[PDB]
Amino acid sequence: GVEVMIALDISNSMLAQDVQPSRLEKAKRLISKLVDGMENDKVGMIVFAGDAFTQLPITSDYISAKMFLESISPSLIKQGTAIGAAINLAARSFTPQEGVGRAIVVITDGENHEGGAVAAAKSSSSSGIQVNVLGVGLPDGAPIPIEGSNDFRRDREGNVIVTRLNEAMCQEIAKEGNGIYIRVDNSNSAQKAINQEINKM
Ligand SMILES: [Ca+2]
Fold it and tell me: Could you tell me if 122 and 176 are in contact, meaning their C-beta atoms sit under 8 angstroms apart?
């Protein structure tokens, strides 16, 4: 068995709907598939935007993990995007259990704002903790819809924000984390590939 810490981006850009039904909802279904495909592993979950928090400590209760997905609330996280902080928190969140594989799975559009994500991945992998990245979204660009509104999120100048999958950043994080990068399209297929990479730990 391997210990797997999910780090899920719940920042505002994840509400973009360039992938159906949104980046966040696609990510939630991927996590659900991922845990339903576990047998011997343990799983935990961190959510992050401007800061990172552990919702679910590492556990054998896969079903509990699925339940946390239903209550995810981007309305209730500091705003922003802090992948490095999430990796750092994840790296310190595994059990001391002797000789067990440890893997971090970051799920994000990679629109990182802060620096240090690559350095965090390097630190993690140096210590033996693999960092994988599942990129959700498209590189083209989509706006961010506001629930109960016909409008989209705007910047300080009043223009519509366009958010894009930052593939280069996600790929570099996975590389330095000794892990894999997958651009998520078929969530069931992405799930198999990540389980396949994890099952070498
Ligand atoms: Ca973001």
Answer: yes
